[PDB]
Ligand binder design. Sequence first.
Ligand SMILES: CS(=O)(=O)c1ccc([C@@H](CCNC(=O)c2ccc(C#N)cc2)c2ccc(F)cc2)cc1
Ligand SMILES: CS(=O)(=O)c1ccc([C@@H](CCNC(=O)c2ccc(C#N)cc2)c2ccc(F)cc2)cc1
Lengths: 545, 545
Amino acid sequence: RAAVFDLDGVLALPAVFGVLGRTEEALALPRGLLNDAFQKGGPEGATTRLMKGEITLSQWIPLMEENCRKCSETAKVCLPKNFSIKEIFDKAISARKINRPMLQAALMLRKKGFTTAILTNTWLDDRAERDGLAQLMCELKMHFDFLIESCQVGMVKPEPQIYKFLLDTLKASPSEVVFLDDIGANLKPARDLGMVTILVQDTDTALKELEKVTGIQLLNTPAPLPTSCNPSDMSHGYVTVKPRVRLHFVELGSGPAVCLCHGFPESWYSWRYQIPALAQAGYRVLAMDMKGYGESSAPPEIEEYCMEVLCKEMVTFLDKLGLSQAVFIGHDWGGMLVWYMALFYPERVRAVASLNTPFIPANPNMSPLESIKANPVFDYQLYFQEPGVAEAELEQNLSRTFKSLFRASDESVLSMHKVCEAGGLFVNSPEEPSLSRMVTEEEIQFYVQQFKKSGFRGPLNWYRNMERNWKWACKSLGRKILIPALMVTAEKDFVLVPQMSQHMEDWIPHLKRGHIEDCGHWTQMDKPTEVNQILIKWLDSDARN
Amino acid sequence: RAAVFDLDGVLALPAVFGVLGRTEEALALPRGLLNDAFQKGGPEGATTRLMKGEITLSQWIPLMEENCRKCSETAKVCLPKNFSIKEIFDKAISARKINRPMLQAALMLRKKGFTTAILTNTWLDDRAERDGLAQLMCELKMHFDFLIESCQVGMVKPEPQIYKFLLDTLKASPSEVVFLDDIGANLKPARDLGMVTILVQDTDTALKELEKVTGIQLLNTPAPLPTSCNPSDMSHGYVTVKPRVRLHFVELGSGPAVCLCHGFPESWYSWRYQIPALAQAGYRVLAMDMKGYGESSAPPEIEEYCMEVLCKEMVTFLDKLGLSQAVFIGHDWGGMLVWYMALFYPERVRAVASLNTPFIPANPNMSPLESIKANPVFDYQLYFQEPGVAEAELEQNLSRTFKSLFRASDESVLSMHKVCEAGGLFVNSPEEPSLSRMVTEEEIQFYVQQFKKSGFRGPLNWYRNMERNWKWACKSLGRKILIPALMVTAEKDFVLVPQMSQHMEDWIPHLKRGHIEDCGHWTQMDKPTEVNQILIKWLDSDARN
Ligand SMILES: CS(=O)(=O)c1ccc([C@@H](CCNC(=O)c2ccc(C#N)cc2)c2ccc(F)cc2)cc1
Ligand SMILES: CS(=O)(=O)c1ccc([C@@H](CCNC(=O)c2ccc(C#N)cc2)c2ccc(F)cc2)cc1
């Protein structure tokens, strides 16, 4: 089945066309005058030339002016002193926003296997403010299989040929397609060809008709998840920071650079729900494969994964990309890394935020090993110390590893206490775990394929530098973090517990906080919507300025 | 040999330290008061803690205030009502600019085989305006082999240990190193260790001493070329636009996106002289391998290289990167592509500029083949038509191909007239051309290695769509280009001659122009300095806003 949506008055409101009407009233012009001038000449008039791509919007403005003068002349009325078609359309175009419920329905239909398309009468926009529209189309168009624009195909609704062209690109028969439009005249040829047609006035009634005919719930459905990433559709970047070390990243959006740093044992892909949201919010997102992971290099030496070297390489990464600063947002081990970036390279850090991981200053009077002992839930970290032991258990069955790890707070385990005595992470774990509700089998297989390259040696080495990190961290014991900073705690992270962050204000006076209840350790995919809301509010506040 | 430069008062002026003096005068304070408060406590004072990285600049401010109060108390003077150390240093830091002649000397020394370094007493900067400094250090640091900062190594000049640390990272003996500094006290330990030392007051005298001791001309040398790109040091991006098509690009900088499009038969690397300049000027540069080239995909089908498909893929490229617009700058075939982007996708084009290639509207009354015949210098294009003929000649000896093509206007040939009758491009060409003054043997071998992947089939296919491009271009004959536009002509391009652009104002009313005399077809490497000046002035005018 197929579903086809118009843009103006359907996926975007208010219909620019509906501004003519409101404008007429405001200026106290005769009803319909502006709409009349707009369509004047029908098939051979200025506006049809515009919609077929014969001329640009800026060439059209003067033509529209002329039609307005002729219409006012005929109607025996005068147009206002500073009457300006340029200004009127600027405002109408800018006012138009995405109709979220209609978009949501479109996403549901595609998710359930429909091929979807936007078919729109539109123009080539060369106005100085054309970027606003450019941004609208971009956001919408990514959610659809096809976008057919009159000005690119040289055809316009309601000409019968464009409907045949639609069916051809849909590779579907008319009876297999639903077509939604707010303009009855433009529906007729669709109906004539035999497709199901919906006349959109109010969105809710339209979606009622739409769910009735497709047999799929579209109205009053549960809150959808944020948009995710298809790895194959992303821009992949590669930067050599040292002769044998290259960092891979995925990049999306424009605006202030935002560098996302994942935890153990994860991937750039762990940010899949924030990447599109942050980009759409006006940021240039750079989601790293951290050293040891995925398409980034994974040298064997333990020392290659100490915080001092990892931080230095992140600075080099910025240097090579030509960035003086980025905002750094980290989760888990990535969260610890970003605190040290703030502490040692404040000049390069526009702002810093950590999910789950608190900033804990080094204790100069206690070995890090001792500190780890003094906390039952930290037992698995000692298990990780001896090279080879954990690698073997984690690498044995990768699908099992990730299905056991990536689980919501209710779906547990694992129980990271008494792991050493038990003799392993999964010693009490099923061979074939159920799939957690947070992930799909396909998402799990992505992580599986990523870890086939380098395995767990690199990732585990992040844990094998306790003494070295402690020494380096001690150098910072006189400092405070005084750049913009955000700490997000997760109620149900049973290792990185919210109370671990209780004293951070001592080191970070102006610290801002967020808190997510009913949220386990895997914050980004556990509660993506709330994560996105927290980060975006904080970015627009403390980074973007 | 090695050369080591201080930052403040050497590679950057004025020395922030020299603001204390000017500030004292402006406020009519006792001479030296501010400088005294700044150094108070010597080895154990607040400022030494700052320079060793014990505390940040923002923690230091209050300490400096206190020292100022104590000094004024002792001197029996009062400090002004709104005396503010924060404000004073903000201004001093911002005023500091790169000392271009000193940098130039450093570049020459490195070019001639010196290992170079910056050794600086500096601080961890967590001020709200820290990015200004971040940007200074970034620009400087890329030109040096090492940067040693006191606050990162926990040592400060003039402590003897930092000089030993310098020598260790230089891997050189004292007698092999020259050390330039504006502070005599900081030179002594260097001199004591036996290195050559230069006390920098005025830059010119310092460079006089420097050239005398190195035996290399540093003063009043010819204008250097702009900074180039080392392919291994760049960020490389990859985007799949279609199942079998991926576009590779190099990316540098932040700010408005600027997409550079090369010509035939070139590479992203053809922009090597503009990439660093444009980034430094405040743009995010994306230099493409165009379809058919380098690390981009090279499908065999001729139709894959028509303008309609190439343009559509560039739009998809923007879509996947999350960019609503980019400025498009093209040269040669890239220049033609960018004109069509402006014409068919104005919404996505922030601004458009072409080097050499004029915009020539399609002639609806003449086949493109006919038009090509009507111009002797276009003869080589007919030679290119039949698949396989030109590929064989261009692929036979790649080094020869590029050494013959990439030549300044005086160093010619080739003579692209009567190529068909002659039976080939190089039929009158030497087997082993001399190396043009525009390129090095190493640059030539880069192009050689790039074309080993896909050869010339893809690139030649750009020429094999004359009829198809003409048909598509005819659809635009009613339009004008009304977005910001720049045409740069080159006096000595004997194919894309400046007079070919004479009527462009008819189609592009607000067209801006640049013109480069004594410039051949290979504009970017022929006259990189002037290209950079023209583009940057136009960007800051018509794109950046
Ligand atoms: C029981 S639960 O709440 O669901 C939960 C589940 C999984 C984990 C993570 C934790 C990984 N992170 C760190 O070990 C870490 C340590 C120090 C700093 C510092 N500084 C940062 C991260 C984990 C644990 C064991 C694994 F084999 C894989 C992943 C945490 C809580
Ligand atoms: C004699 S000189 O002045 O030094 C000179 C040297 C080399 C060239 C370039 C020209 C390539 N470009 C185009 O053929 C082109 C055509 C139409 C549009 C359009 N629209 C764009 C480019 C060239 C020519 C032959 C080659 F084998 C390789 C490269 C031009 C002038």
